[PDB]
Amino acid sequence: ERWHFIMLNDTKRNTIYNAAIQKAVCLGSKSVLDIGAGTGILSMFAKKAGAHSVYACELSKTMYELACDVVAANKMEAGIKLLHTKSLDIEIPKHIPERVSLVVTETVDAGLFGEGIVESLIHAWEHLLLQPKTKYGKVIPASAVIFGMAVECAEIRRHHRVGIKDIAGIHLPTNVKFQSPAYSETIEPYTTEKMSRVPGGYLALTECFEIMTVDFNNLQELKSLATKKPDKIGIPVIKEGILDAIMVWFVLQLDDEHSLSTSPSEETCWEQAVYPVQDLADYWIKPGDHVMMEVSCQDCYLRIQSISVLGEQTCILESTEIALLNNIPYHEGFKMAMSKVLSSLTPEKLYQNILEPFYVLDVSEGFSVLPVIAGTLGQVKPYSSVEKDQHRIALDLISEANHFPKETLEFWLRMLQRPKSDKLWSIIILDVIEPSGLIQQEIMEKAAISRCLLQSGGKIFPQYVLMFGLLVESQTLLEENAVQGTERTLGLNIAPFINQFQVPIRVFLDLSSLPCIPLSKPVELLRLDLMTPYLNTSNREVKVYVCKSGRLTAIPFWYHMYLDEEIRLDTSSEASHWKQAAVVLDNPIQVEMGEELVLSIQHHKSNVSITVKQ
């Protein structure tokens, strides 16, 4: 899986875990239990350090098997007992012969507590560990400190807060309040983000501040957190700005001399816990104001709630759907493209048959306002494909706000068919690209059918799609998909086993913040034609000029969706609500400036293959 590679490659982090483990062992902790073993690297550190008995546990069947192959491969099978289990179900005598002197754990998320560290340690203290110091029990990490900072970060803003009251000719009324899932018990108490690379960056509106401290060697304290009353915190603003989120990170004290941080300020890129700020009448803050907030640990996660900045339908949307509503070119693009079709067909009906509306079908996967924009253009009968009742309500409230009479907007749901037994659609809109940066399954099929349900001059949107790509050198993508030798793992042979599992195509990327070096200019890789199924190739060669000598590790890719030949949507734009993807080469290639590289592109249904011919 994903973060195992980047963490195994972090030699310095491995060096610090090894130093701390060695110290505990050299000081008498010869009986160790590794919770969340992964490949068993920390268990091996313990054994090679001088431990007599090492036990390790892992919930994942793939990781368990992987660790067995690794540990046996490093000839440490004797002395390390791997347990395919959850730490909470480890019994005494039955699984482990006796209580241990040391527990080592690494089951930590961006918000510290999200992997159930506290529950695992309470159980470990009550049943697996020797009594604490009055031969005694100890836990690595010994303690932790959680920090926060209030920030401005429009990248976060556009995913948790709708920033416009009017878009592409339609009004979004005040009585429809949109919220993300991180609102508020709430669904996602926080998101996780690499704030070091967040597109557009971020600004600090407060100084860094301590949120809380935890002692993992203190059972009473750990048991106490479930009951602990929330902490009310008031933080002074040092900079004028738009309050977008509380950025939270932490520091692990493994022992008195060693520590790890997930601060954005580190040279290693770590995720931070991100708590969006929403549900305020004003987000503008100025020096002298205070950001107030309640902090609690009670319900399995660190929660920052009721954020104030002191100095009527609710519609919950996915962050993608919020980013969508904030993507203005997208909606301005559709408005224009729809009007151009409508005046091609029936100019009189744009603001022969007075009783016949233009029929428009939106087949978007989730929340969409394209049907309302359509309805405002002329004598149009727009159909929506939304499923959720909260979405229907919202669209009915928006229709009212935009002067529609009741039942103007239809809800198609409540397969692809004619609007009426004897009618055909003027416009059909298809969802072609996944938020992941890949092509939607079954679109060629939907485009083929839809083509049969159109009026003499009707259109499918987009009419066609171009896929683009670029040749790059990226050491980061390499580090994230494969372990780079044994030096990093302080000599242990781990890379040969974990690298059995390489990802061919990375998804959900933000190319705009990807560290890489371009080796070519963007080149067209594939063309899909939704209006004309016979024009779609299944095999294609592409000649690419290499502009820079370097090592080709990957091929990022994205799309231009043409609604018209005058109008296109870009999936890599600043406001794009789609993420991008990249083809990662398993065997990176050396390329030279002036070279002409040939790519071989195969396309079948929604699956695309890109290979270097070479």
Swiss-Prot record:
It is found in: Cytoplasm. Its main location: cytoplasm. Residues 1-304, 327-614 form the SAM-dependent MTase PRMT-type domain. It is an enzyme of class 2 (transferase). Optimum pH is between 7.5 and 8.0. Its EC number is 2.1.1.320. The keyword Iron does not apply. Changing residue 109 to G: Abolishes enzymatic activity. Signal peptide: none annotated. Optimum temperature is 37 degrees Celsius. GO terms for cellular component: cytoplasm; nucleus. GO terms for biological process: chromatin remodeling; methylation; mRNA processing; regulation of DNA-templated transcription. GO terms for molecular function: histone methyltransferase activity; protein-arginine N-methyltransferase activity; protein-arginine omega-N symmetric methyltransferase activity. It catalyses: L-arginyl-[protein] + 2 S-adenosyl-L-methionine = N(omega),N(omega)'-dimethyl-L-arginyl-[protein] + 2 S-adenosyl-L-homocysteine + 2 H(+). Transmembrane segments: none annotated. Changing residue 269 to H: 8-fold increase in MMA production and almost complete elimination of sDMA production. Keywords: Cytoplasm, Methyltransferase, Repeat, S-adenosyl-L-methionine, TPR repeat, Transferase. Belongs to the class I-like SAM-binding methyltransferase superfamily. Protein arginine N-methyltransferase family. Arginine methyltransferase that can both catalyze the formation of omega-N monomethylarginine (MMA) and symmetrical dimethylarginine (sDMA). Specifically mediates the symmetrical dimethylation of SF3B2. Involved in the regulation of alternative splicing of pre-mRNA. Found in a complex with PRMT9, SF3B2 and SF3B4. Interacts with SF3B2. This is Protein arginine N-methyltransferase 9. It comes from Homo sapiens (Human). The lineage of its organism: Eukaryota, Metazoa, Chordata, Craniata, Vertebrata.
